[PDB]
């Protein structure tokens, strides 16, 4: 109907684009990157230029047939906090438990002056009433032993111990910033009685989601398929891998020989990935990425990589793209409140668009735009909204990519024996629940260095309640 | 060590490779074939309707159903709840089909099979429902995993055995009925046998039940396979396009809201006169020779685990008549099929670091054979090259059912599901890995590839069964 803006919209998709040559340069980048954060450098290094790649002090896979009695785990997301009761059975099969509760908004509010005791306070009074609901006649009696998520930069230091880098995703307090959060944790839960909970474990949600898969996949699934990957894609994303001690050169000289001498081989890498050229020297990058990043994020500078990837933020990408078309006088938002609202629209909108279909003129598309911001639609306006957020998650899927077919390379995961598949623990609600994400993150991963014969050889593999189960992994191992 | 047998193994391994120039041809062959088949012949594939016109939904739910499932090697009795929300329980009895059966030393009847089946049927009912055994009005799903000239959903007379089965007076008679005489004649007349359906029939119906509503969002299951002791598959066709099927019947099912109606290929009669198909000497002596159905079957011939053990042998016989290879002591000279699929499977992924241990004591254990290494080391040469074939040729019905249908680009980011089931896909080393390799391989490329997932049906077939009685009545 309008010409002028259906080619204002068209040259906007062209921007998301990301082709084979991108792939295979970020790919190559990617290992550069995690080659630099391989080795130590200084508290602050003003260019380090290298990814975090955080040990994570975890050095043994699961089996599959680890068993013991009923372990708690804590998981903190970026949207949701989770209690659990994990009880291992071995032979990959496990019992839980689980009660999920958002996060307040009260936390992500800077009007108010928010502080690390309200939300460690917050989460332990959560921990008491998943206890008081399913295990109410020993809650203050057991010694339980708890695995605690911490799905944001941790500088671990022991599989017990680490101070939060800096916060991500939104959350904003000072206060906790250079903290050792397993400590943070414990001494709320210590105030409300329960010192008999112990957090014996501190991980990423990464790691947790890798180990949580290395236990579950059956024993015919382990011959062939060997899990080598634990990433997210949700709130925001990052991913682990195994690395070989020798190449850990960051980790203490000396450790890597105990550990070495001890039977192991490799230790847990928490890439961080979020971060993944933050300096922004070669990921796509349109004026609304540094519009979110600079102005409308609570980290500008930080987690660039996750800044066009994650669930947080995609959907805030499409409401600056129509803001831009309506200053340009070429779109109507009427009476919406996308003005002064950042993030009013969410992810969770955009999976209604991405697959709405136009024999039904699009009505998904108009309820879920109505529904998250009061904007109303004509379908050639749907059907121009369709096609900018078709383009904002193809990107996402396709640098979504990146990172694994990275991985994958430095560690010569592919080149294994006849028929050998290798298997890519995924959690989070966008691989999980976005219509064609994963289907998108595989024809990257064919156009990235691999190809299509390495992309065959890759199963990402979706692992539900991943994070809580590989805390209760951790947990178990450890001691009371 | 011995050089001139090495460059032997070589040469046959160079024999059973699959291009993909030669894919696409099988491809584009085998959709030609389907057209040829939908249509009359009063005398291309088989292309049978099946008349299941309505694929569940997943939410159905009913009263407690039976199901019995004839195989190529077992029969299984059981009973299904379907509980709607894609969940069901089952309670089953698998049994062997004695070796009575495939043995032409004997006069075989059909009602020596269907006399038995009620036995068992008898048995299971005493066993899980002995209160409710002559009590209840039973409604039982037949699976009966052989080419049927199907001409209702309650009704089908067999055209041919295959498998090993040899029974003559089956032939042209109604299965349905022979079953539920038998059924009648031992006091179960209280159980009706409402409706017959192939194991791929069965098998896409359960998992159009059992795939998750999410998953039917952009998921849809198109094609119900098998790949076991045999080798099929089905698929939804247009109606109009099934032009062998009564014109008025057509008409009616229209006017009902049907659109499509189930088709099972039968593709394990796909190109039996050789026109294209890949041959070795050794699939013409299995055909001529050890096969019950010489000229019938010949892609299931290639495929299927009935016969890729038998292929082994006689290349092993082959190489020991050449005098390359030591067959020592060993029983597989003059006994056809000693070597089966599961003992290949053994040899499929062994690995040198443990001297390929699992070849040789599979090897012992099947017909008594010793091995070197350096012998163990080209028998894996010769499994891989059989198995890799199998799966490559295993491909082609999949890729050319998609095609003809265009199944893969009916909407953004629409992905399709194939339903599998067999001992072969189910259980054999990387034998979905090479599938999908020769799909990429196949006119539908790695996009295409990428759009088809290929996912097990452990208990379809009787889950299905179980649905077709649901909807039929008493
Ligand atoms: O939740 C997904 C990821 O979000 C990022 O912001 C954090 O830095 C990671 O630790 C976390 O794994
Ligand atoms: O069991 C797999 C297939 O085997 C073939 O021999 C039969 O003719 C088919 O009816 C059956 O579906």
Request: charged letters at 25%; a negative charge.
């Amino acid at each position: 109907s309008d010409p002028k803006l259906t080619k204002a919209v068209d040259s906007i998709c062209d921007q998301f684009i990301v082709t084979k040559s991108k792939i295979s340069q970020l790919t190559e980048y990617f290992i550069d990157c995690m080659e630099k954060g391989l080795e130590p450098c200084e508290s602050d290094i003003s260019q380090n230029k290298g990814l975090p790649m955080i040990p994570t002090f975890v050095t043994d896979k699961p089996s599959g047939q680890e068993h013991g009695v009923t372990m708690l785990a804590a998981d903190l997301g970026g949207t949701n906090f989770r209690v659990c009761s994990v009880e291992l059975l071995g032979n990959h099969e496990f019992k839980i438990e689980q009660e999920k509760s958002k996060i307040p908004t009260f936390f992500f509010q800077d009007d108010h002056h928010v502080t690390s005791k309200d939300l460690f306070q917050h989460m332990a009074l959560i921990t008491h009433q998943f206890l008081t609901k399913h295990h109410k006649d020993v809650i203050q009696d057991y010694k339980w032993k708890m695995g605690f998520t911490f799905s944001y930069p941790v500088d671990q230091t022991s599989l017990s111990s680490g101070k939060l880098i800096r916060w991500t995703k939104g959350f904003k307090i000072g206060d906790t910033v250079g903290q050792d959060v397993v400590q943070l944790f414990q001494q709320e839960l210590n105030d409300i009685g329960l010192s008999n909970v112990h957090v014996v474990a501190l991980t990423n949600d990464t790691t947790g989601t890798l180990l949580a898969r290395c236990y579950a996949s059956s024993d015919a699934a382990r011959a062939i398929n060997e899990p080598v990957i634990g990433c997210i894609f949700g709130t925001g994303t990052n991913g682990c891998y195994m690395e070989k001690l020798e190449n850990i050169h960051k980790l203490d000289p000396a450790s890597r020989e105990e550990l070495l001498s001890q039977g192991k081989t490799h230790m847990c890498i928490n890439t961080e990935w979020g971060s993944f050229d933050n300096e922004l020297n070669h990921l796509p990058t349109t004026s609304y990425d540094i519009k979110i990043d600079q102005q409308f994020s609570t980290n500008p500078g930080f987690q660039l990589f996750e800044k066009r990837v994650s669930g947080l933020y995609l959907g805030e990408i499409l409401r600056n793209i129509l803001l831009d078309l309506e200053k340009q006088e070429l779109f109507d938002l009427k009476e919406s409140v996308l003005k002064n609202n950042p993030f009013i629209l969410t992810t969770e909108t955009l999976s209604h668009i991405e697959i709405d279909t136009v024999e039904n003129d699009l009505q998904d598309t108009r309820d879920a735009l109505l529904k998250a911001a009061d904007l109303e639609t004509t379908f050639e306006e749907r059907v121009l909204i369709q096609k900018l957020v078709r383009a904002i998650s193809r990107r996402a899927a396709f640098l979504a990519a990146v990172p694994i077919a990275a991985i994958l390379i430095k560690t010569n995961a592919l080149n294994q024996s006849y028929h050998c598949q290798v298997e890519v623990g995924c959690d989070g609600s966008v691989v999980e629940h976005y219509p064609g994400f994963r289907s998108m993150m595989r024809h990257a991963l064919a156009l990235s260095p691999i190809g299509p014969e390495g992309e065959r050889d890759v199963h990402l593999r979706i692992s539900k309640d991943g994070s809580g189960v590989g805390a209760a992994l951790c947990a178990l191992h450890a001691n009371y």
